[PDB]
Amino acid sequence: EFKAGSAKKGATLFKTRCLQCHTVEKGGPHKVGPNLHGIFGRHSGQAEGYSYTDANIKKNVLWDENNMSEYLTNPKKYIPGTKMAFGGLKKEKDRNDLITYLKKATE
Amino acid sequence: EFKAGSAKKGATLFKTRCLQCHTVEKGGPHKVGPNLHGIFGRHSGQAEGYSYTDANIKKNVLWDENNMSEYLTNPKKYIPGTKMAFGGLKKEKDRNDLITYLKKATE
Amino acid sequence: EFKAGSAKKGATLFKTRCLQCHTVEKGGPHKVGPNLHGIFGRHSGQAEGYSYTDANIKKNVLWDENNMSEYLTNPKKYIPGTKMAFGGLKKEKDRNDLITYLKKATE
Amino acid sequence: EFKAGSAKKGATLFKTRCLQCHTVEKGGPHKVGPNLHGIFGRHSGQAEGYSYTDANIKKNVLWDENNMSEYLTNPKKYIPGTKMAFGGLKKEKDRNDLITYLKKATE
Ligand SMILES: O=S(=O)(O)c1cc2c(O)c(c1)Sc1cc(S(=O)(=O)O)cc(c1O)Sc1cc(S(=O)(=O)O)cc(c1O)Sc1cc(S(=O)(=O)O)cc(c1O)S2
Ligand SMILES: O=S(=O)(O)c1cc2c(O)c(c1)Sc1cc(S(=O)(=O)O)cc(c1O)Sc1cc(S(=O)(=O)O)cc(c1O)Sc1cc(S(=O)(=O)O)cc(c1O)S2
Ligand SMILES: O=S(=O)(O)c1cc2c(O)c(c1)Sc1cc(S(=O)(=O)O)cc(c1O)Sc1cc(S(=O)(=O)O)cc(c1O)Sc1cc(S(=O)(=O)O)cc(c1O)S2
Ligand SMILES: O=S(=O)(O)c1cc2c(O)c(c1)Sc1cc(S(=O)(=O)O)cc(c1O)Sc1cc(S(=O)(=O)O)cc(c1O)Sc1cc(S(=O)(=O)O)cc(c1O)S2
Ligand SMILES: O=S(=O)(O)c1cc2c(O)c(c1)Sc1cc(S(=O)(=O)O)cc(c1O)Sc1cc(S(=O)(=O)O)cc(c1O)Sc1cc(S(=O)(=O)O)cc(c1O)S2
Ligand SMILES: O=S(=O)(O)c1cc2c(O)c(c1)Sc1cc(S(=O)(=O)O)cc(c1O)Sc1cc(S(=O)(=O)O)cc(c1O)Sc1cc(S(=O)(=O)O)cc(c1O)S2
Ligand code: HEC
Ligand code: HEC
Ligand code: HEC
Ligand code: HEC
Ligand SMILES: [Zn+2]
Ligand SMILES: [Zn+2]
Ligand SMILES: [Zn+2]
Ligand SMILES: [Zn+2]
Ligand SMILES: [Zn+2]
Ligand SMILES: [Zn+2]
Ligand SMILES: [Zn+2]
Ligand SMILES: [Zn+2]
Ligand SMILES: [Zn+2]
Ligand SMILES: [Zn+2]
Ligand SMILES: [Zn+2]
Ligand SMILES: [Zn+2]
Ligand SMILES: [Zn+2]
Ligand SMILES: [Zn+2]
Ligand SMILES: [Zn+2]
Ligand SMILES: [Zn+2]
Ligand SMILES: [Zn+2]
Ligand SMILES: [Zn+2]
Ligand SMILES: [Zn+2]
Ligand SMILES: [Zn+2]
Ligand SMILES: [Zn+2]
Ligand SMILES: [Zn+2]
Ligand SMILES: [Zn+2]
Ligand SMILES: [Zn+2]
Ligand SMILES: [Zn+2]
Ligand SMILES: [Zn+2]
Ligand SMILES: [Zn+2]
């Protein structure tokens, strides 16, 4: 389901839809949401120093491009009970582009 | 998000995937499943003389082309506890073709 | 043209699409379908103690990953007359994952 | 299932793998195979002036991009007894490119 898209558009989607709550850089600070560096290949709810809902820990997924796409389609449906206040990215090209940027920004 | 496809292809899809349990002709007989004539524009679980599950009755949808496509994607997810033994047409062209045929067959 | 995939999601596919009729572990019970331990590398229809159809027996193939994926694409096409009532896994990444799991659980 | 590919790329496929037996332009001449101008949207076995196997005529398909693709994968499997001596384009992107060229050259 995930196909690599445009990192450049993905960077703008993040600025307007996520940066509000998240930083991406290594060592960056948690805000409302956790810092996201190294999120791919990591278990849900494990960023150091961030205090998660139990449902984000207990979802128990190893983040990759595909379950990230599914999550960002509808976060509170993929993880019922999350404090991530965000409706979701409905359009699949917006998802591929954002995940393309996010991979590059967080690896 | 339903779109008219091939009724000839839908007829074939129907002969091979639905015909076992279903008829389409006006006043046709029930089999394992209810005869389907007049289904579009009727409430669910309302073919005369057929014993549905309570779930199929209480679902309380009015069949049109779009929620029919949603139903045929994963019938047990759309109507939990339905006794229809069918995995689903996962491909969208197949659902468009079948619904194109089915609308012509049952109207 | 099998390529290794995710045993973990192949596990998930097995219990949703196969477990109702099959067990996998060594010495496991026959149910509707035969216990499958040791399937890869055996001729078809050779699980001791299971009562097969003539067609599944006379098919005369040695199961590997490849012809298994052909079979699971359309079981009744590959073995005309089989009493396994299963439509098939149409998508290759689904068969890939399931076969990767099945091979690990049956070897 | 068909996806528009590269007409140019497909043009090179046709010269190497088809032109030996076929021509494409309006009014083009018959060779070993028939001239293919107007093939899409026409019944099988109809090109005016060519002598087809009865197998080709009785396949009774109206050619579009997708049953063309199916066909060119395995001609003898699609039309048993055809007199077209061509093993098939096994790679999916080769069929997409060729059909994309063929649509443009024969419409
Ligand atoms: O494969 S990708 O689609 O991901 C992709 C990645 C890059 C890339 O160049 C392209 C396509 S091709 C391209 C597409 C578009 S367009 O499609 O947007 O019109 C405009 C241009 C352009 O060259 S010109 C331009 C415009 C702007 S802007 O005025 O600030 O928008 C900034 C930069 C720039 O060169 S600098 C700049 C800024 C970033 S960023 O992501 O950090 O913002 C990335 C890159 C940059 O070069 S690499
Ligand atoms: O059931 S739960 O989803 O709650 C769940 C159970 C377990 C677990 O660790 C986790 C989640 S956390 C997690 C979630 C996801 S996921 O979000 O992508 O699904 C992927 C991974 C991951 O670590 S990485 C991984 C990848 C693969 S591979 O794909 O086959 O190569 C095999 C294993 C493995 O760990 S091994 C392995 C195999 C299985 S079983 O299902 O095959 O029996 C179970 C376990 C394993 O450790 S316990
Ligand atoms: O934001 S939502 O996730 O809620 C969401 C709701 C709807 C929607 O179209 C989308 C996303 S877009 C979408 C996203 C994803 S994914 O990225 O999440 O993988 C996969 C798909 C997909 O199409 S494919 C698919 C898979 C299944 S499955 O058999 O259950 O797997 C059933 C249906 C289906 O289309 S049918 C279906 C059934 C229902 S419901 O009423 O029965 O719940 C609602 C809808 C349906 O389309 S509207
Ligand atoms: O459920 S079904 O098994 O029936 C089934 C039907 C179709 C389908 O796509 C699939 C499964 S999925 C699939 C499964 C397998 S597998 O089973 O071998 O692993 C291989 C392939 C593949 O794509 S690649 C392939 C290989 C060959 S080969 O050269 O003969 O080997 C010919 C064709 C072809 O596509 S052509 C071809 C010819 C016809 S027909 O109408 O002329 O019979 C129909 C179809 C064709 O694709 S639709
Ligand atoms: O199909 S036809 O062979 O009749 C044909 C079509 C077109 C065309 O201009 C010509 C011949 S004339 C010509 C002949 C030869 S050659 O004889 O030496 O090979 C080389 C060139 C060239 O210009 S240069 C060139 C080389 C390549 S390459 O093959 O990828 O390296 C791609 C393109 C390109 O411009 S871009 C390109 C991409 C496409 S599409 O189909 O991918 O959308 C179509 C066209 C393109 O120009 S129209
Ligand atoms: O808009 S639609 O896409 O729905 C559509 C509806 C019709 C239609 O003609 C077409 C497209 S165009 C077409 C497409 C295909 S193909 O796509 O299958 O290759 C083959 C042909 C063909 O002419 S030739 C042919 C083949 C056969 S067959 O040997 O029995 O298959 C029966 C008939 C027939 O003419 S008679 C026949 C049987 C039926 S049915 O529904 O009762 O099976 C419908 C029709 C018939 O004329 S109307
Ligand atoms: C504020 C309203 C936020 C918006 C905008 C975005 N995110 Fe978020 N996110 C937020 C919180 C408070 C949390 C923790 C959730 C919990 O239940 O504890 C999250 C979580 C995530 C995660 C999971 C991180 C992990 O498991 O370690 C991801 C991958 C994530 N968020 C991504 C993400 C994206 C891509 C966003 C833009 C589309 C986005 N978030 C916006 C708060 C907020
Ligand atoms: C036997 C295993 C069946 C297959 C094959 C198909 N259908 Fe079915 N259908 C079946 C049953 C037993 C029921 C009643 C379920 C209940 O819970 O009461 C149904 C129901 C439907 C309906 C709803 C009719 C209504 O009045 O609400 C529809 C629209 C329907 N079935 C369509 C359908 C299609 C399109 C099929 C081929 C893809 C198909 N069915 C196959 C049994 C079986
Ligand atoms: C019940 C409806 C079943 C489902 C679900 C699955 N299988 Fe099946 N299988 C079933 C039966 C009754 C038989 C015997 C077939 C016969 O004709 O006698 C089988 C057979 C197999 C085999 C062949 C075993 C052999 O020794 O050759 C295989 C490899 C097999 N089944 C695999 C399989 C898979 C992978 C399934 C999930 C995708 C699956 N089966 C489901 C009954 C049923
Ligand atoms: C010589 C070995 C050929 C090669 C190379 C190609 N084609 Fe062919 N084709 C050939 C013959 C002798 C026939 C008639 C077969 C019969 O049974 O009568 C055909 C037929 C076709 C058709 C069908 C035409 C119709 O009117 O329905 C098509 C669409 C076709 N051929 C296409 C085609 C393509 C795309 C080729 C390159 C991959 C190709 N042919 C090569 C002889 C030969
Ligand atoms: Zn998708
Ligand atoms: Zn989907
Ligand atoms: Zn650049
Ligand atoms: Zn650039
Ligand atoms: Zn630590
Ligand atoms: Zn793991
Ligand atoms: Zn784990
Ligand atoms: Zn959708
Ligand atoms: Zn890093
Ligand atoms: Zn859709
Ligand atoms: Zn017609
Ligand atoms: Zn849907
Ligand atoms: Zn869908
Ligand atoms: Zn009527
Ligand atoms: Zn393949
Ligand atoms: Zn593990
Ligand atoms: Zn296929
Ligand atoms: Zn063993
Ligand atoms: Zn394909
Ligand atoms: Zn050009
Ligand atoms: Zn050019
Ligand atoms: Zn017609
Ligand atoms: Zn016709
Ligand atoms: Zn094919
Ligand atoms: Zn096919
Ligand atoms: Zn294929
Ligand atoms: Zn023309």
Numbering used by the authors:
A (entry chain D), B (entry chain B), C (entry chain A), D (entry chain C): -3 to 103
Article excerpt on this structure:
Here, we describe the tsclx4-/Zn-directed assembly of two proteins: cationic α-helical cytochrome c (cyt c) and neutral β-propeller Ralstonia solanacearum lectin (RSL). Sulfonato-thiacalixarene (tsclx4) provides possibilities for protein surface recognition (e.g., lysine encapsulation) while simultaneously supporting a metal site that can bind to other features on the protein. Whereas sulfonato-calixarene (sclx4) consists of phenol monomers linked by methylene bridges, tsclx4 is bridged by sulfur atoms that enable metal coordination. The metal-binding capacity of t-butyl-thiacalixarene has been explored extensively. In each of the model systems, incorporation of the macrocycle–metal complexes contributed to protein assembly and crystal packing.
Co-crystal Form I grew in the presence of 30 mM zinc acetate. Synchrotron diffraction data collected to 2.4 Å resolution at SOLEIL were solved in space group P212121 with an asymmetric unit comprising four protein chains and six tsclx4. Each of the four protein chains was bound to tsclx4 at Lys4, similar to the metal-free structure. Four zinc ions were modeled, with coordination by one sulfide and two phenolates similar to the binding mode observed in small-molecule crystal structures. Interestingly, a fifth zinc ion was modeled adjacent to the tetranuclear cluster. Additional density between the tetranuclear cluster and the fifth zinc was modeled as a bridging phosphate ion. Neighboring residues His33 and the C-terminal carboxylate of Glu103 each coordinate to the fifth zinc ion, while the side chain of Glu103 coordinates two zincs in the tetranuclear cluster (Oε···Zn2+ = 1.7 Å). His39 from another protein chain coordinates one of the zinc ions in the tetranuclear cluster. Thus, the calixarene–zinc complex acts as a bridge between three protein chains, one of which is bound via the calixarene cavity (lysine encapsulation) and two of which are bound via the metal site and exo interactions with the calixarene. Form I, in particular, with 1.5 tsclx4/zinc complexes per molecule of cyt c, has minimal protein–protein contacts.
